[PDB]
Structures are given as C-alpha cells and as structure tokens.
Amino acid sequence: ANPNANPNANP
C-alpha cells in the first residue's frame, strides 16, 4: 500500500 495515495473521496 502507498502512504502517498489520494486519501480523499473520488480519485
């Protein structure tokens, strides 16, 4: 898993 993935709704 990527700690810098988008953490907000609807990427």
Partner: antibody, heavy 127, light 107 residues
Amino acid sequence: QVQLVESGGGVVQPGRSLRLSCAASGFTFSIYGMHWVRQAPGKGLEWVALIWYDGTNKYYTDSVKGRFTISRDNSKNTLFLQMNSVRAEDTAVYYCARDAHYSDSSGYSSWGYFDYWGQGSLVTVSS
Amino acid sequence: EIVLTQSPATLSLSPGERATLSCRASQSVSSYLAWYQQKPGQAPRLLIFDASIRATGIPARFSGSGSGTDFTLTISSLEPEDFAVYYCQQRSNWYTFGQGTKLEIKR
C-alpha cells in the same frame, strides 16, 4: 466557513495517554482525508499521521507508530489522535489539517498538502 | 527519507522589495512541493502547491517555481503582512518539511 477546532490538550505524565479532538465545520468532512502535524517548542513542522476520508487506511510517522492511533467519527465531524505511551519528545503543539484535495476542469488532481489547519493544541509531556 | 534544506536561514528586507527563498531536496520530488507561511502563535498557511500553483485566497505577489531538486518561492513586492517564517514541504515520498526561513524586517 471551513473551521477546525481542537480540544483535549494539556499536561500528561510520561507513559500515560491523552486523546486530542478536532471538530470540523463548514465543509463536507466525510470526503476529505485528514492529518495531524506537530511542532515542538522553537522547532519546525513534523507530519504525524493521516487517515483516509472513510476511516479505512491510516499511516503514521515512524517515531509514533505503535503508540499513537488516528481515528475519525464522520457522523460527528470529528477527527481524533489517541496518544499512548507518551514521551517527553512528544511535547509539541499538535495541529489537525485537512488534505488539500484539488482538481481542475481537465482532470488534474492533487493531494498530500495541508490546506486548512486547526488552531493548535499544546501537549506537554512531563512528570 | 527526503530531506528539504532551505536557504537562507534569515532574510532581512523592507516592504516593496523582492524576496527570493530557496528549497533544495536531497533527491527529486518531481513537482510535489508546497510552501507555507507561519506567524508566531498561529497555524501555518498554504501558499503554493505542486511547485507553482497558488492556493485560493493567496495574493498574486507570491509565486513558486522549480522542479526535481531545486525550488524557489518569490514574493515580488514584500508587504508588512509577509514578515513570517516560510517552510517548504514535499509529498513525493511520505511527508517532510524544510527547517524554515525567517523573513524579518530590516532596520
């Protein structure tokens, strides 16, 4: 309208626990990732932890991993930092911050910056 | 772990003058860089993100440039409300900040 109001700070003895709260108003809390960032007295900014909009994924900086827990209650528009096993080096002003989600008319999308911040809550770890 | 190094440590200027602040990363961060302003006792404020995009509500005198490892924040005409500490931050690999540059009033 965007507001983040923190509460829960104060003095805590080493080894004990303290829970911080960040009450959000003025935006759709449940669509935003949320972070905690801290600033020790006289020093710079250090990212602490992040939680996804839906409470699933959570990430922590190495020095707090296994001691602090991030959580949120979307129905109450509140973000939490549960600080356990605290140490003197955790003394700092703790800020909550919203993930600066950004998009344009052409499908560009950004995140991973801190666009609105709480007022800060001082946590003093001392005996 | 990416280390961001800011220079100079202090800049001493007068209103009206151009201020140039530098941030150097230990390895490339592409364009995933932001700049913040912070005044004593207050929370930081996001100025610039993705190296060069101005945040909503930020005056046009603030601009950011650079990519890779070398970045610059320019304030084209300093105004009194700009005296503060400035930090850079990257989100290419985890989340780290520079150590700050203080922009102080010369006299």
